[PDB]
Design a protein around this ligand. Structure first.
Ligand SMILES: CC/C(=C(\c1ccc(O)cc1)c1ccc(OCCN(C)C)cc1)c1ccccc1
Ligand SMILES: CC/C(=C(\c1ccc(O)cc1)c1ccc(OCCN(C)C)cc1)c1ccccc1
Lengths: 222, 222
């Protein structure tokens, strides 16, 4: 069994409850608040998680920040996708916050949650395993295509190392499909597309708040 | 040598000149007109090209249209990227229409053309070959993630067939890097991201015109 995959499995953060405020009337604002508060907590643990990825900490702080800046929404989305694989037309943002179509409509997230469900659909068909999920999260971080990378070569080595882990996993676990690793890689474009739209929506409705995201990753990394 | 790759090479369309109107004063409008007129001509030949891809014609007309609808901007962009690999900070839209930074600024395309140059940068480092380019164009078509596919399984078989061709090519041509096929696949997210932004920009400034894109692919396919 592949050691990087094993390591990523033990580095996996614990479940986080959303705790929607039971005193607040249901509304689009309440849904967005709940999601913002959930994501902020998730981002803190994502930063800690990334430090476990072999080679990530040896990048400059600027490069670590750049990768995180570019990847954070993909990592959040891949999480909700994975959590939702055993459900039907619903998204498990947390065990206590499962969004059906009516809820998504109410939150103004129909189009976005429908795209996320498209990711779910594909991964259900492919029978996405936890091992594959955690490896793809790490790959999405390393492959996030920041336009501000200092050490392009080191970031490529990190991509290489993680891709190798996925290939080695699939070679051992899935001999019935010698192309499964590539199929997994071919799911990344839809994740990127969905993230891109989610981030556009995030800025369009001003969820970023008073303090820029750049400084937030700084505080947490420094 | 891989037959699908060989076939794709012979299916490659001839060069198309942009023919910017020499009587028209240079302006953002002239640049956008030139690009619109270039793309429209390219789209006609792209539709003919897709018919050469093994299995594409045996899909329903609806599925052919769906793949084209979802992929067309990626295919256009991958073309300009490939045409630009031997240039520096300039995009070869056509032999007679090469956009430098000043031109992009003037056209309102700085951000978009900069993203396209990011694609170029990565492919230069990877030493992207024509064989790899034409194969990735076909993969981008098949992997374009339309939300309206009728025969999900047939579209997967098409993805499979093209992925197999890339893997077989790389296995024979690039034994020094057993992971090169996966590296090529890992370039697709940035293409998707760039296309997504280009399409958003395309609709934001109303370049679609009086007739919807759906009917355009119909006419040309029927
Ligand atoms: C898709 C749901 C979502 C977020 C989300 C996704 C996955 C997940 O596990 C948790 C949340 C989302 C919402 C807000 C957000 O902002 C965090 C920044 N702070 C400073 C508010 C990030 C993601 C969202 C994204 C954009 C607009 C509206 C909602
Ligand atoms: C990135 C350049 C570009 C186009 C382009 C890209 C590659 C290429 O080889 C040729 C052109 C572009 C521009 C217009 C366009 O519309 C075609 C639809 N008709 C009906 C006008 C498609 C692509 C463009 C895209 C969006 C907004 C503005 C410009």
């Amino acid at each position: 069994y592949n050691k990087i995959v094993s390591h990523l499995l033990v580095a996996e953060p614990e479940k986080i409850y959303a705790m929607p405020d039971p005193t607040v009337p249901d509304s689009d604002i309440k849904a967005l608040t709940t999601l913002c508060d959930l994501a902020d907590r998730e981002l803190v643990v994502i930063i800690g998680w990334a430090k476990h990825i072999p080679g990530f900490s040896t990048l400059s702080l600027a490069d670590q920040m750049s990768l995180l800046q570019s990847a954070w929404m993909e990592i959040l989305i891949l999480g909700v996708v994975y959590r939702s694989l055993s459900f039907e037309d619903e998204l498990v943002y947390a065990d206590d916050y499962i969004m059906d179509e009516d809820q998504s409509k109410l939150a103004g997230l129909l189009d976005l949650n429908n795209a996320i469900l498209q990711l779910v659909k594909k991964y259900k068909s492919m029978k996405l395993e936890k091992e594959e999920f955690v490896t793809l999260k790490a790959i999405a971080l390393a492959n996030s295509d920041s336009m501000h990378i200092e050490d392009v070569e080191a970031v490529q080595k990190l991509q290489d190392v993680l891709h190798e882990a996925l290939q080695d996993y699939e070679a051992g676990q899935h001999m019935e499909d010698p192309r499964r690793a590539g199929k997994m890689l071919m799911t990344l474009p839809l994740l990127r597309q969905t993230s891109t739209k989610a981030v556009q929506h995030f800025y369009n409705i001003k969820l970023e708040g008073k303090v820029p995201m750049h400084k937030l990753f700084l505080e947490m990394l420094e």
